[PDB]
Amino acid sequence: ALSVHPSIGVARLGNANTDNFVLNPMEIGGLPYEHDVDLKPTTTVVNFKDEAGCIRRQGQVFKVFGASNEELTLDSPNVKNIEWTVHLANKKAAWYEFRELNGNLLYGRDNSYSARGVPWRNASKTASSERQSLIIDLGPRSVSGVMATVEISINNIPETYLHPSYPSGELLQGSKHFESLGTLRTDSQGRLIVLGGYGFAGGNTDGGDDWYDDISDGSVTCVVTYSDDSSETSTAWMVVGSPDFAPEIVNISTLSDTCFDVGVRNFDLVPDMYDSATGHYKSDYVANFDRDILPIIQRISQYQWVSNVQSMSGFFSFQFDYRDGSAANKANRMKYYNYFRQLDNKVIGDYDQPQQVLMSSEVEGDILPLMPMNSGSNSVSSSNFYDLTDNVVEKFLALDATQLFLLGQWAEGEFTAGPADDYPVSDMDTASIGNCVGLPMCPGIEMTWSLQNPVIYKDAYQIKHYQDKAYFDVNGLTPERDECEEETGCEPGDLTKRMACPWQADFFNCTIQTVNFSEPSVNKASQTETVTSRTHYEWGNLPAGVSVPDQSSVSATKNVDEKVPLPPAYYSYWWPPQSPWDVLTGELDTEGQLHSHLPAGQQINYARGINSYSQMVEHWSALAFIRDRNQNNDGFPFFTETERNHELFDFKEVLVGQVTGNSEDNETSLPVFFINANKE
Amino acid sequence: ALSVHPSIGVARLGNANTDNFVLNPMEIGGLPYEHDVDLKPTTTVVNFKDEAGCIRRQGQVFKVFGASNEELTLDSPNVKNIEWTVHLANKKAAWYEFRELNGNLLYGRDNSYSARGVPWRNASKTASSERQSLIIDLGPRSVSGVMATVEISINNIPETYLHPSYPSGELLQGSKHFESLGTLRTDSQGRLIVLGGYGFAGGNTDLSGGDDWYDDISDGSVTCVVTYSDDSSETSTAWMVVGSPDFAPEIVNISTLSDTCFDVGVRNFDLVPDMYDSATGHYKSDYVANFDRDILPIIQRISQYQWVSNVQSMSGFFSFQFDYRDGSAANKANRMKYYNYFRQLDNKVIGDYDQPQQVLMSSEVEGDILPLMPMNSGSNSVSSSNFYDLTDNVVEKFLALDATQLFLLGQWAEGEFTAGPADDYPVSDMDTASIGNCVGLPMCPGIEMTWSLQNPVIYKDAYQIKHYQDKAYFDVNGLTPERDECEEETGCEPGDLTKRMACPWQADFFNCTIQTVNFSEPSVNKASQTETVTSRTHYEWGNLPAGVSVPDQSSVSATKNVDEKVPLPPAYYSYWWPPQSPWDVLTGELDTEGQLHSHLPAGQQINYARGINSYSQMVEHWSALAFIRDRNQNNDGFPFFTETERNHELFDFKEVLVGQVTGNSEDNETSLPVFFINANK
Ligand SMILES: *[NH2+]CCCC[C@H](N)C(=O)O
Numbered sequence A: 001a002l003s004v005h006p007s008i009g010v011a012r013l014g015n016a017n018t019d020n021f022v023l024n025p026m027e028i029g030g031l032p033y034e035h036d037v038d039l040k041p042t043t044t045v046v047n048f049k050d051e052a053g054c055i056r057r058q059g060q061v062f063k064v065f066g067a068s069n070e071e072l073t074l075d076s077p078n079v080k081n082i083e084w085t086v087h088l089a090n091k092k093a094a095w096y097e098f099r100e101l102n103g104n105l106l107y108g109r110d111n112s113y114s115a116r117g118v119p120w121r122n123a124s125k126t127a128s129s130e131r132q133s134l135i136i137d138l139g140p141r142s143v144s145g146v147m148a149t150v151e152i153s154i155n156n157i158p159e160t161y162l163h164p165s166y167p168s169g170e171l172l173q174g175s176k177h178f179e180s181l182g183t184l185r186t187d188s189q190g191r192l193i194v195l196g197g198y199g200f201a202g203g204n205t206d207g208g209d210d211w212y213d214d215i216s217d218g219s220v221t222c223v224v225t226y227s228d229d230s231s232e233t234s235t236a237w238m239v240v241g242s243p244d245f246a247p248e249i250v251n252i253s254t255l256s257d258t259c260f261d262v263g264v265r266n267f268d269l270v271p272d273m274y275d276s277a278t279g280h281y282k283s284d285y286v287a288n289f290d291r292d293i294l295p296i297i298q299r300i301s302q303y304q305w306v307s308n309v310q311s312m313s314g315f316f317s318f319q320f321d322y323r324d325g326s327a328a329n330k331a332n333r334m335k336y337y338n339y340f341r342q343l344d345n346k347v348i349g350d351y352d353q354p355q356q357v358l359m360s361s362e363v364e365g366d367i368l369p370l371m372p373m374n375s376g377s378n379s380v381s382s383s384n385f386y387d388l389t390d391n392v393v394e395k396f397l398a399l400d401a402t403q404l405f406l407l408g409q410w411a412e413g414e415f416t417a418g419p420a421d422d423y424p425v426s427d428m429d430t431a432s433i434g435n436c437v438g439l440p441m442c443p444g445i446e447m448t449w450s451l452q453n454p455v456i457y458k459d460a461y462q463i464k465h466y467q468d469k470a471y472f473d474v475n476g477l478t479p480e481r482d483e484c485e486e487e488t489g490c491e492p493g494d495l496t497k498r499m500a501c502p503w504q505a506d507f508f509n510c511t512i513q514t515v516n517f518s519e520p521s522v523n524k525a526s527q528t529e530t531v532t533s534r535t536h537y538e539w540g541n542l543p544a545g546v547s548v549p550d551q552s553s554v555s556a557t558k559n560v561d562e563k564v565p566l567p568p569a570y571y572s573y574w575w576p577p578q579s580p581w582d583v584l585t586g587e588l589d590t591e592g593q594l595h596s597h598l599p600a601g602q603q604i605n606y607a608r609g610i611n612s613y614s615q616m617v618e619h620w621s622a623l624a625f626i627r628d629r630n631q632n633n634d635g636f637p638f639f640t641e642t643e644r645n646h647e648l649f650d651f652k653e654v655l656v657g658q659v660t661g662n663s664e665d666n667e668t669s670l671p672v673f674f675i676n677a678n679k680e
Numbered sequence B: 001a002l003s004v005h006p007s008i009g010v011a012r013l014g015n016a017n018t019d020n021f022v023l024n025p026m027e028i029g030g031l032p033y034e035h036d037v038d039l040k041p042t043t044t045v046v047n048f049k050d051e052a053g054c055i056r057r058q059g060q061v062f063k064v065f066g067a068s069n070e071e072l073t074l075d076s077p078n079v080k081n082i083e084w085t086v087h088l089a090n091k092k093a094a095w096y097e098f099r100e101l102n103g104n105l106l107y108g109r110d111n112s113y114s115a116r117g118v119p120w121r122n123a124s125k126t127a128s129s130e131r132q133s134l135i136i137d138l139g140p141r142s143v144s145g146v147m148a149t150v151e152i153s154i155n156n157i158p159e160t161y162l163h164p165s166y167p168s169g170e171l172l173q174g175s176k177h178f179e180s181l182g183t184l185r186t187d188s189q190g191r192l193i194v195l196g197g198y199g200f201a202g203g204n205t206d207l208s209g210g211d212d213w214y215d216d217i218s219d220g221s222v223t224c225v226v227t228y229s230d231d232s233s234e235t236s237t238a239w240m241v242v243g244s245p246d247f248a249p250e251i252v253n254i255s256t257l258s259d260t261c262f263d264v265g266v267r268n269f270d271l272v273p274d275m276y277d278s279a280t281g282h283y284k285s286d287y288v289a290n291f292d293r294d295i296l297p298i299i300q301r302i303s304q305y306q307w308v309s310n311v312q313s314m315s316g317f318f319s320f321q322f323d324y325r326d327g328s329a330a331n332k333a334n335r336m337k338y339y340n341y342f343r344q345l346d347n348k349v350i351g352d353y354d355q356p357q358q359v360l361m362s363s364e365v366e367g368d369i370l371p372l373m374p375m376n377s378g379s380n381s382v383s384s385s386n387f388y389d390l391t392d393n394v395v396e397k398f399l400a401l402d403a404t405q406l407f408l409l410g411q412w413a414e415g416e417f418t419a420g421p422a423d424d425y426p427v428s429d430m431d432t433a434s435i436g437n438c439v440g441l442p443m444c445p446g447i448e449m450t451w452s453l454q455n456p457v458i459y460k461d462a463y464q465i466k467h468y469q470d471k472a473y474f475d476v477n478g479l480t481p482e483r484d485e486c487e488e489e490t491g492c493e494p495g496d497l498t499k500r501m502a503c504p505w506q507a508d509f510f511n512c513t514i515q516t517v518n519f520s521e522p523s524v525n526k527a528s529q530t531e532t533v534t535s536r537t538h539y540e541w542g543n544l545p546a547g548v549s550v551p552d553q554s555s556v557s558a559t560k561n562v563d564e565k566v567p568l569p570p571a572y573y574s575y576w577w578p579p580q581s582p583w584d585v586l587t588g589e590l591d592t593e594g595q596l597h598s599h600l601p602a603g604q605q606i607n608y609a610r611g612i613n614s615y616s617q618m619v620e621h622w623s624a625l626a627f628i629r630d631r632n633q634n635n636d637g638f639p640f641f642t643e644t645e646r647n648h649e650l651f652d653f654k655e656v657l658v659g660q661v662t663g664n665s666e667d668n669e670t671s672l673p674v675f676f677i678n679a680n681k
């Protein structure tokens, strides 16, 4: 039988010229690739943006392999053609509003979208045909041969695709005109390259209904026709994400770790590690330091370039020897392990659980944030939101169950030093989704927690397809269908539909969360602040014999905020590798320093100047790519901002006395970055 | 035959207790009246507001007189009963959007609402029954007898009134629940008192938009039926109008609505045959005016504006720099120079822009520059000729007197006038006293009423509104939402005199301030203005060691600001209605407590609306504003008007040092006061 890799492709949006793109990373944490005129990868990316400051699309190369794992191309003996059919769709406008973990069936049927009352997006549209038309679906496109190109355009929808849909005409805010979901190409030997959207994000309100973006996902079909006209067919999936603004920095739990974990616990991917008959990991499984543990430590060690998480420093200091498996070092390994949060169970209404605990202790001397130190998958809504009393809460991050099992085996001394055998997972499969966020997912960046649900897969790393080209040709896509509920596979648009519509809202808010740590069932509460003030006046320096009566009055103010983080609260990151927050300035020449208004080497806010959600929707592409300036020298990283469109931004230095009224404060100033709409 | 006075009553909104009211002024520029328990007027008003800072309603007393001009009351010998029926309504939500002079048929049929394509308010409602239901109409109420009271309430609509309408349920913004248009009472002798609304303004859309908004302004018909001992009866009619508060009742408008009715009367109903020839349509140049009756009030009114606006260029028109009562030849050149500084009236012809009311100054030659008179906005200083998809939108930039006032001023100038008492005009004092306290000009749209009042077709005679149909017709049909009384010419319905005004009226009040008026292009009031600033930044570094140099750096940046409709320069700062919506007024608190709360010393001129920083705040907090009043009223001829009764406690205050704005701490020797409303109080 044939196989296509990667099993889940990953492309990234870009607004540069349609013909100006990079190719996929070839490993987790790898840079994307420049290419030659044959569309073969050459060197790692030189610049992420074009000269005009537009972000280049990143495309995914897919390859097809025969029974003995040899690659099939148009040059293979006995191959006369290879035809790729890709069907991408965006179902976001047709899906439910995002309400954290509501709708996630891993918590049981009582957490279904219907049982939780989650409203549909664009809720005034209630007939099925009206819901279907909210989907962006241009039908499938096909590509085959040497150096082919075809757009997934509203202008070349096949005649056989009876139900296309898209936001038509001139949109009233953001991007005006939707045109394309991306481009399919082949290289010089017939391999597929899928390129995604252009960063379109527009709608007809200011508010939020009737909005769209050009994120998409869907099916990949490959038909290889042999010289005698027989054929074989094999499938994969494809996902488009917004730009990876720090591609060398890897998420502690990636989506590859997610697929792997789902695989181990549900598809017998690693029989030695987990006993599928009983539903437990095997305590005799021996982990491997370099394969299983080291990546966690390395990933933790790079968050400092995009966030302030210094409390994690002890987990990569090598204050003791992480490679020493002896009894003498066991107390040390166990102490390291015991600082990681165990996983919550997935039971509705159970709040007092390890992911609601912030610190090791609150006794002075014994205070450390537990690990990894980041938000969990619901630090936003309390138990009592949305007219529920048992809304699922998950305040703080944990590793996935498989990572954590393997870490425990390390802690126990059940691990080796030296080479391990690879798991039965292709490296091409890990290289795509290993660059996507795995946790937390609220909703996340590329994908959300449907990817944790084994019912969407036909085997580890492989998305199950619902139906086929001939079905969708006649019927179109099914707007209300939940692949997690039906269990019979995914439709185009299913992997990305749950994310924010438009994505730049995920991006604007993927920063930090201020998370309560005193009441397990509470994230936010109403806060009433009453300030009662008595003003008393007296007059003096009066002549002898003169007096004037004092005067006094009382005033009060009452401020009510319906939903604010309950104190005491902890400053917690969301997705530092995918949405940086605290970064170093990198302009080393006078011109870049004048334009950026900053010296090099200073830590500042990554998004400075993008002061509103509407600005992010329009100017996302102006932001920097965080990159290792010392990449040639392994082990001595120096990550700074590169390629920020500094000219977009204006700048004012406000003296502190401007705010306070005290001119002595003007010895200190506050830098303010912003975007003036009136600039040319 | 009976007659009812006033012909057109005027009441004013108030949010104090329903039982806490003052009665109508008795003369033009008169204070309203306190009253006794019989509801008879006593002495002029003490406080305009109650102790809680809520404005007291002003009610209108109506009286009915017999064929001898003798007043009839329940105490009159041959009188068995007097029964009053008042039908007030608010048609504002069912009328057209206000678009300055569009719809005004005095400019010809080509200026009709339909020819001009003016849209309806709440334009999504198009069936006649749905338009009708936008009207606030609770039917008529009747009152008779000694000390009666009946509310114009949603809870006492007569069963015979088949189509009442009003905004039901809870409104989403501003006032939540509509309940009443006002109160009818009788006094101890059976006279009518009409009190109007309570200041309700609410709607279902956000004004920060403005569809499905309502206020409790109203107007409508008054019917009096007098029944005699023998059970015979006679009937007579009047009209009634409710306006927002008069915040400076002692200060009179240069042209009042009494002047409007008078002018309309002279020109169209033969009210004064010796002044105007109705067969040829011209004034009579041999009419001899009277200084005290005709001229002096203009001069006096001009002289009061200084208490509420900065109009110092008008000072020469009341200085007595020469003798205004000298009608001799030797003084004619002076009287003529005075008259010639007044704007003549524009002709109401579409497309004719180069006319006297587009002219600001006597000239722009140094030494010969004076703003023409009266110096104020006209009835369209807002929209240009090319607005609203039109090419010949009617413009009228600057104020003129009315045609009658100006005729009489010219008779003065020519020396055709008397000193001494005059013949009164055949107009009751009781008719001038009501509407003489309303704005007559300009009307864009105005305050109480707008330019329909200038149209003779709504009148059956001078000062008398013509009634369309009758009580039975409205019992069955309700009111006619689309009907223009000015187009049909067969009379007014309840709601017709106020429906054109802003909905809610607090928009008219928020904007009745000043206008920056272009005076270079007669067809233009506003234009788009594009300001492009192109900036080259250049850097050089110096004081470097010997042999060291670094290159200069430079770059270029630009901003392009586009405002779509702003006054076209050069422009002139022009008032709207200083008497009715004050702008520059004197602070009035003479004791320490009032000064601490106000944050100001007494005697300082400051902005009247300070702290009301948005339209939405005006809609909520109109009633906090001051009444401008003569603190020296006991001493005739020595006025001293200041704010009184401002609800200072509503407002917060910040003193901003100028260096907070500029970045230069040396500028901190100077500060700017900023008043505002913190909703979290
Ligand atoms: N995946 C990130 C969502 C951010 C949530 C936001 N700060 C909130 O409190 O609503």
Ligand SMILES: N[C@@H](CCCC[NH3+])C(=O)O
Binding pocket: B382, B443, B444, B445, B446, B508, B511, B512, B513, B514, B515, B576
């Ligand atoms: N200032 C307003 C009009 C004033 C309305 C007064 N009667 C404008 O430019 O629209």
